[PDB]
């Protein structure tokens, strides 16, 4: 790996610099390098890893959607034949997207998840695993679409089981996991009722625990709760 010669602390420092400069590809490479040093990650370091790859794959997903829409329009009746170029370029972006997902899932499997014993770290990583299988599912169309969906579901479910046992209902990681699992149900699994039910129960149980929080923790929890409400409004 190209980052094998750089100190762990220097990689973390440069990831923070890359974030400030909005250089998310660099940020992701630095954090990949830091993970490959083999030490566990702190909370702050997990956040850097998450931000970097979310930004990279976010750009790819937005691009893929534009191209897929153009491709779908070309394959209607009345549409003029423009040759293989739209499909080719959509496939190019899709392959790069799948490569980023595979890289992240590879880091989780080798060996972040197996060393993660605390609830905060284990739930975060299993949520991430769910998320990146979900992004793979967004572009999947073949024999493995079903298996990819089940891989996402399985990761989210294991995360949910731990979070409900080990974390308060207002914990931001627990809340963010439930948000993303509800999105999985609505957008991927064709289960809008499961999505709505999860969003509602999550919201109500968090609401009832807000009284236990400080001002700062309250602000953190309520921000995510608003996103659950935004989805419920969109869905009902």
């Amino acid at each position: 790996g190209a980052m094998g010669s750089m100190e762990r602390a220097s990689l973390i420092q440069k990831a923070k610099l890359a974030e400030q400069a909005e250089r998310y590809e660099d940020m992701a490479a630095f954090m990949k390098g830091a993970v490959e040093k083999g030490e566990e990650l702190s909370c702050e370091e997990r956040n850097l890893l998450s931000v970097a790859y979310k930004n990279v794959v976010g750009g790819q997903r937005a691009a893929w959607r534009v191209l897929s829409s153009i491709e779908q329009k070309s394959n209607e009746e009345g549409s003029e034949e423009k040759g293989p170029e739209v499909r080719e370029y959509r496939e190019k972006v899709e392959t790069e997207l799948q490569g980023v997902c595979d890289t992240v899932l590879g880091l989780l499997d080798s060996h972040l998840i197996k060393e993660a014993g605390d609830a905060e770290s284990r739930v975060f990583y299993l949520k991430m695993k769910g998320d990146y299988y979900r992004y793979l599912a967004e572009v999947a169309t073949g024999d493995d679409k079903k298996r990819i969906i089940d891989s996402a579901r399985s990761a989210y479910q294991e995360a949910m089981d731990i979070s409900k046992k080990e974390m308060p209902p207002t914990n931001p990681i627990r809340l963010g996991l439930a948000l993303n699992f509800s999105v999985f149900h609505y957008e991927i699994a064709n289960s809008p009722e499961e999505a709505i039910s999860l969003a509602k129960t999550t919201f109500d149980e968090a609401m009832a625990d807000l009284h236990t929080l400080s001002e700062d923790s309250y602000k953190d929890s309520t921000l995510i709760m608003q996103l659950l409400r935004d989805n419920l409004t969109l869905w009902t």
Binding site: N47, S50, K54, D131, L179, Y186, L234
Partner: peptide, 9 residues
């Protein structure tokens, strides 16, 4: 429009 998932903080 698409559902909202967790943002970057």
């Amino acid at each position: 429009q698409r559902s909202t998932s967790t943002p970057n903080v």
